[PDB]
Each structure stands twice: as C-alpha cells, then as structure tokens.
Swiss-Prot record, chains A, B:
It comes from Methanosarcina mazei (strain ATCC BAA-159 / DSM 3647 / Goe1 / Go1 / JCM 11833 / OCM 88). One of its GO terms (molecular function) is pyrrolysyl-tRNA synthetase activity. GO terms for biological process: tRNA aminoacylation for protein translation. Its EC number is 6.1.1.26. Catalyzes the attachment of pyrrolysine to tRNA(Pyl). Pyrrolysine is a lysine derivative encoded by the termination codon UAG. It is found in: Cytoplasm. It catalyses: tRNA(Pyl) + L-pyrrolysine + ATP = L-pyrrolysyl-tRNA(Pyl) + AMP + diphosphate. This is Pyrrolysine--tRNA ligase. It is an enzyme of class 6 (ligase). The chain holds residues 188 to 454 of 454 of the full protein.
Length: 260, 260
C-alpha cells in the first residue's frame, strides 16, 4: 500500500527539483528513471558541460574581467602553512599527507604568499583570485563536503574598504543570480568576519584587513577578501536538497543520479 | 670575473625561453628582474589568465565541441580502486590518505565507473573526458611532477578503432600547435600502448580496448582512450627547460619566476 521509507529514499535519489499516489513504487521509479535518462541524453546531445567546471569558468571570467589575476597554486601544501595560519577544531579537519604535507583546507596561505611576491612586480592595488579543490574532514553531509571547491578573491593596497568588498560580493552574486544577505560574524583564524548568507546557509566568509596574522606572511598593507564554496553556490542555484548533488562525484552528474 | 655556478642558476631562474659577458652578475640580474617584472605587469594589465587554467579551458572546449561529455569526479579516491586497476612500482607512488583513501594517480578508475553507469542512459557511443589533478610520488623533477594535471578522454561502443584514436590525438595536438609522433609501446596496467612522443618526452599514453581489466569494472564493450599531462603540453608549447615552470606553483606564474 503506502511507500516504505527505503522506497521513498530511492525515489528522492531520482527526483529533480523541477519534477512535479496511489501509484505503486515500480511505476513511479520507472517514470523517474525515464526522466533522468532523458535529462542526461539532453545534456549529452546539447551542451555537454559539467556544472562544477562550467561554474568555475563563469566565475573565472567574472574576476578576470574585473581586473583580478587568475592563480593556480598547489593543492598539496606544507603542514607548516596550517600552523602559520594560526590553526592549532579546524585542525582535526586537516587531511595529512606524508610527514610534512597536507591537503589544503583553504586558499589563504598560498594567496598570502602570492600577495607578498607580486607586490614586488605589480602596481597597486594587487587583485588576485583562485578557484580550486579544498579538503576538510567533516562530521556532516547536508551542507558539508570533505572534498569541495573554493573561490577566494582578494585585493591588497588601495581601495581595500568594506564598501568595495561588499560591492564586489553584491555584483558577483547578482551576476550569478543567487539571493543573499551579508551579516557581521566572527571566526578563530580571521576576525571579525562578514558572512554572506543564503537563508541559513553560509555562502561565504569575508574579511576586511589588515589583521595581525598578516605579519607572519610578510604582509603590511590593507587588504580585503572572500572565500565562496562553489558547491554551495550550485546547491542554491539549482535548488538541490543535498549538497552531494553539486560535488565531484560518481553518484551524481549535474545533480542527476548516475545510478539508473 | 666569470659567473659562478650559483649565479648562473640564479640567472637561469630569471631567464625566459625568448630572451636573447663580460657584463657582471649584478647588472645581468638587474636586467632580467626588470624584464620579468614587465612580463607580469603585461599579463596583469591585459589578459590575466593562468596558463594551466587557460589550457584546461581550451582543451575542455575542444572535447565538448567534438561530442565528449565533461566529467568532474573525485580527486580523493578509495584505495580499492588502485588494486582494482591491477596496480600491486606505480604502487610506491600512491599518496595514501586516511586508512581507506588515496590521491588519484590517474583518471582511469573513475572514468571506468562513468562509462559503465552512463551506458544505461546514453546512446552509443559514449564519449567522455576529464581534466584534473593527479598525484604520484616521483624521484625525478625534469619531466616529472608529484602534483600534475591529466587530461583523459575516451570512447566506448562503436568507432573504437586505432584509426579514430590516432585521428583524435592528431586533431588535438595540431589544434594546440604541438609537434608529436605516435610510437607503439607497453605498460603494466594496460598493454600494448601507443605513446605520443615529443622528441624523448612522453605527452601521452593511449590504449585501444578491450583489455581483460575491463571485466573488473563491468565493461564488456570496445573502447579507446588517452591520457595527456597538461604541464608536459605547456612545457613543449612554451619551450620551458624545466616542467616546474608549468606546474601549480608559488615559484612560477605562467613560467615567470615569482621570486623577484
Ligand atoms: C587570501 C587573503 C589572504 C588570506 N586570506 C585572505 C582572503 O582573501 N580572505 C579571508 C577570507 C577567505 C575565507 C577562507 N580563509 C575560509 O576558509 O573561510 P571558510 O568560511 O572556512 O571557507 C569559505 C567557505 O567555503 C565553503 N566551504 C567551507 N567548507 C566547506 C565544506 N566542508 N563543504 C563545502 N563548502 C565548504 C563555504 O561556502 C564558504 O563559507
Ligand atoms: C578511461 C578509460 C578507462 C580506463 N582507462 C581508459 C582510457 O581512456 N585510457 C587508457 C590510457 C589513459 C592513460 C592513463 N591511465 C595513465 O595513467 O597513463 P600515464 O602514461 O601513466 O599518464 C598519462 C601521462 O600523464 C602525464 N604524467 C604522468 N605522470 C606525470 C608526472 N608525474 N608529472 C607530469 N606528468 C605526468 C604524461 O604526460 C602522460 O604521459
């Protein structure tokens, strides 16, 4: 008669945000299987782009067009960078590799190094961004991924104000068509942050520098910056119930179940 | 009088492929510093794209345009995938994470899974590609990186011939403007390979399936495929002497020293 919890989980795997009893499980599953097969057929026939790759390209274009230098820095980083970030909490979340390296939990340490290095070469202000993989061991799975993709943009020198920071965030999310509000918060590493919220979901943490951590990185200039999770952005944009639908995955492709 | 070996190493750091005694070290270094600062100034003023990101976008466009589905699969993969790949040599090169996961040394295991899964949804033949980070512990540094970027494209079903494989490789490298020759070789995992060579540098290993390893992955169809290192491609394209100039790096940006 009624659907079992397991059957309901199965159908929810196959259900897409835009799909609209007493039909049996077998027929409801058959219908959804058919719809999802067609969705993949249509991607494959027409656009062929992965949502995560595509979102990366669109964001890349956005920040390049606005004068930010595209960075591609190591994903595998020295463990010393974690301790020099003031992280000794987030520390139980570090995936260690060999005795000396770890998978980066954020883009900040490498970007600090780039800011200092490029200050010797580039005119004020220095505007840079990176998009790439980051890793944190996470107890949750609703809004948290162990393997995720962060965007971090930043500016150092002139014009490093809270206004300009907010303006960039605003232009950015309006460009992407993502609703948001900016609330003042704090964290252990940075501040004093600004959190960019979608309802109760954190899209970004942002900071207006300087902060005292800067000195450890040879930075003695005003700066502003923000990190965004690309999977969180996709989750909002596509109305995905679970963030796993927006991840690097063998179970979902563009939020469509691959288990068909 | 003459330059010391250390001074020569310093200048070679600052030397670009296109730059053309008895001038002292200080003046030669000063000149190169000036040229490299201007190179970064010109990137920053004009294009602002990272060579590795840009190469990824151009390759992405190439394979999308030719009917291949863009994949973004996990970088952190189960250790079981390594053993199911027939790897028990390359095994000392695996960067292990936790007791159960590793950093992927190749794209093949995840793409095998995608081929099988998508066969239930997509018409014959199934054409897919991924571009992303791969990791191998490496004794060398001339043509080898521990952290690199692989392109792997493949097709399964109809038209999985050596001719079509060679044709795609040929169209691809001619598109990129990279000189090559295709030699028959072999490896422990696959074959029987075709190696795509630039002089003595391996750009790619390629395979015409089926092979007996397929059965472990639920694959029972003809297939063809090739993996290319993006850093190797950049190394050839830009005439870089060391592959570290083409890597994710805090020491080089688009093959320009960041230590200025
Ligand atoms: C570069 C300069 C010099 C140093 N720092 C400067 C800067 O530009 N800005 C300071 C603020 C950058 C934010 C960054 N350090 C950071 O790690 O903040 P988090 O809030 O911890 O990470 C940003 C978050 O990425 C996403 N994210 C987080 N963990 C997950 C998860 N496990 N699953 C999926 N998504 C997640 C989440 O969407 C977004 O809130
Ligand atoms: C997906 C289907 C199902 C399974 N396999 C199929 C397929 O499409 N093709 C089989 C052939 C794919 C090749 C892949 N399995 C492989 O790992 O071959 P390798 O020769 O070991 O890696 C390809 C190499 O990537 C680059 N590369 C390697 N190690 C490094 C390094 N340490 N530093 C920098 N660059 C490097 C190098 O340019 C290029 O020769």
């Amino acid at each position: 008669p009624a659907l079992t919890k397991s059957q309901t989980d199965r159908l929810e795997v196959l259900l897409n945000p835009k799909d609209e009893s007493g039909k049996p499980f077998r027929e409801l599953e058959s219908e959804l299987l058919s719809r999802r097969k067609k969705d993949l057929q249509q991607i494959y026939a027409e656009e062929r782009e992965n949502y995560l790759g595509k979102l990366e390209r669109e964001i890349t274009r956005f920040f390049v067009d606005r004068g930010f230098l595209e960075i591609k820095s190591p994903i595998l980083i020295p463990l010393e960078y974690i301790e020099r970030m003031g992280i000794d909490e987030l520390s139980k979340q570090i995936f260690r590799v060999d005795k000396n390296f770890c998978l980066r939990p954020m883009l900040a340490p490498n970007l600090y190094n780039y800011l200092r290095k490029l200050d010797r070469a580039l005119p004020d202000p220095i505007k840079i961004f990176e998009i790439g993989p980051c890793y944190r061991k996470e107890s949750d799975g609703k809004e948290h991924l162990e393997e995720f993709t962060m965007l971090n943009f930043c500016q150092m020198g002139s014009g490093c104000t809270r206004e300009n920071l907010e303006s960039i965030i605003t232009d950015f999310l309006n460009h992407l068509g993502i609703d948001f509000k900016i609330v003042g918060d704090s964290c252990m590493v940075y501040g004093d942050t600004l959190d960019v919220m979608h309802g109760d979901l954190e899209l970004s943490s942002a900071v207006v520098g300087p902060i005292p951590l800067d000195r450890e990185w040879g930075i003695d200039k005003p700066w502003i910056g923000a990190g965004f999770g690309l999977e969180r952005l996709l989750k909002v944009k596509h109305d995905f119930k679970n963030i796993k639908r927006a991840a690097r995955s063998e179970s979902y492709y563009n939020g469509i179940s691959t288990n068909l």
